């Protein structure tokens, strides 16, 4: 039981009651095409938008947050890692920072996040897959990611770990951390599942990305059976769905 | 670890390589629309057939199994209680059986059972929801079906349980069931779930039995990941890719 709210500015995440799906985003055509989708997952039952050099990135991704915050009354994380991207994307309308390389490629980010006051996302990342012992170290890199997001002034409670599947990982190491991945929640923070299609669903399955829709199912039941607040996922529809079975199970 | 086979005369089911996919089988129609079904569960992953008065049953069933062992390599379960259509659709080509009363309804079936010297599915059921404490309750009424057929000759490794989900529990005791399935392990025997498709999927998603799939797949991970052998199955494709994935994971 979480004691307190996820405060996200307009909207309010409570952490009790359910599993929360952060549903994945993909001119006129582009914007447009973006606003459509997420209005389809904000109705197949998606609680948070997820909107993926520095010049460009911020003059691809301003357009759609004012777009989609405007037409969808959900709260939007932006998915980057560079300071300047993460500041001009809340001012533009975004609510949570989804970071994958946990505050560790761009420092100030963090600063960025304490600053405006949002929930940060950190990922587990790194350059190499050199570990010693995999979840052991996944721990102590997570947690140097959380000694630079509190040193920089971000608040406990705006602080969400993310065990980082398909980074920095392989194929067998990525099942070692599914099937460890309680394991994170001794650090006492939310965490944010995102496996969805990914390559080692492939490489167990033997399947294409477009035929991965059950292997995700399988993880995504995995993780929330092992404690997980979030879920990351392209198909909302059917993961929502079975998030849901999931909690009455569980008795979430 | 299981340190026997499953035997079923002709094939063996090892029960440590994978979770065993048991799929559902629904004159010149009947049958080969029966045919056509079994052989595409063949085909989609599954690992055994289940087939479901006392004259007419035979009547039914017989030509069935007759067709489906003939032209379909895969071990075959009669989805009886009544002990006279066991022993003729064991004659008729049947290597396991599955009985809903768990040897309570016909004691005479589990003799049968001895007899032939095949594996048994003794299932949780009862004429009421009564119950003092759910799983205490359970385990000790599958335990009466374990001396019923015990006491007639059973071999401990031809006895299979399942909880009985949908049977004689209430769409609430069902989820808590599901919660508790771990403990029916205590008892030393392999577990075999059936949740396809079932009404309590659609009373917690308010969805109609076609629109169980999503529902269905969250039960199946969420039981092998507490230790069933066996789980049983309408969608055979989703639900082998699921089961898959569950087994790279919790590394079985
Ligand atoms: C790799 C990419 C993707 O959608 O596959 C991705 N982007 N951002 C992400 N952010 C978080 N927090 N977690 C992810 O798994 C993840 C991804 O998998
Ligand atoms: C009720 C019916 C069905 O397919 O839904 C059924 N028949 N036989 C069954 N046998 C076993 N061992 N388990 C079941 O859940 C089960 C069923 O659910």
């Given at each position: 039981?979480?004691?307190?709210?996820?405060?996200?500015?307009?909207?309010?995440?409570?952490?009790?009651?359910?599993t929360?799906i952060?549903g994945i985003?993909?001119?006129?055509?582009?914007?447009?095409?973006?606003?459509?989708?997420?209005?389809?997952?904000?109705?197949e039952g998606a609680?948070?938008?997820?909107?993926?050099?520095?010049?460009?990135?911020?003059?691809?991704?301003?357009?759609?947050?004012?777009?989609?915050?405007?037409?969808?009354?959900?709260?939007?994380?932006?998915?980057?890692?560079?300071?300047?991207?993460?500041?001009?994307?809340?001012?533009?309308?975004?609510?949570?920072?989804?970071?994958?390389?946990?505050?560790?490629?761009?420092?100030?980010?963090?600063?960025?996040?304490?600053?405006?006051?949002?929930?940060?996302?950190?990922?587990?990342?790194?350059?190499?897959?050199?570990?010693?012992?995999?979840?052991?170290?996944?721990?102590?890199?997570?947690?140097?990611?959380?000694?630079?997001?509190?040193?920089?002034?971000?608040?406990?409670?705006?602080?969400?770990?993310?065990?980082?599947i398909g980074?920095?990982?392989?194929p067998?190491?990525n099942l070692?951390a599914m099937r460890?991945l309680?394991?994170?929640?001794?650090?006492?923070?939310?965490?944010?599942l995102g496996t969805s299609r990914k390559s080692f669903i492939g490489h167990v399955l033997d399947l294409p990305v477009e035929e991965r829709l059950e292997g995700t199912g399988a993880t995504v039941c995995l993780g929330i059976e092992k404690?997980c607040?979030?879920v990351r996922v392209h198909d909302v529809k059917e993961m929502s769905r079975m998030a849901k079975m999931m909690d009455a199970m569980?008795?979430?």
């Amino acid at each position: 039981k979480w004691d307190y709210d996820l405060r996200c500015g307009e909207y309010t995440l409570n952490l009790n009651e359910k599993t929360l799906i952060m549903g994945i985003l993909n001119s006129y055509n582009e914007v447009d095409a973006a606003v459509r989708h997420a209005k389809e997952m904000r109705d197949e039952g998606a609680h948070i938008i997820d909107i993926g050099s520095v010049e460009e990135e911020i003059k691809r991704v301003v357009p759609m947050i004012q777009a989609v915050s405007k037409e969808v009354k959900l709260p939007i994380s932006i998915d980057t890692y560079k300071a300047e991207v993460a500041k001009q994307a809340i001012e533009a309308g975004a609510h949570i920072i989804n970071d994958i390389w946990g505050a560790k490629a761009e420092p100030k980010i963090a600063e960025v996040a304490a600053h405006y006051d949002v929930p940060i996302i950190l990922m587990h990342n790194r350059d190499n897959m050199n570990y010693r012992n995999l979840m052991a170290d996944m721990i102590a890199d997570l947690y140097d990611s959380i000694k630079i997001a509190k040193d920089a002034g971000v608040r406990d409670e705006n602080i969400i770990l993310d065990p980082g599947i398909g980074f920095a990982k392989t194929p067998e190491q990525n099942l070692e951390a599914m099937r460890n991945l309680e394991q994170l929640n001794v650090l006492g923070y939310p965490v944010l599942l995102g496996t969805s299609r990914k390559s080692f669903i492939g490489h167990v399955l033997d399947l294409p990305v477009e035929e991965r829709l059950e292997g995700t199912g399988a993880t995504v039941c995995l993780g929330i059976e092992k404690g997980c607040e979030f879920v990351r996922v392209h198909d909302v529809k059917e993961m929502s769905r079975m998030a849901k079975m999931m909690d009455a199970m569980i008795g979430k």
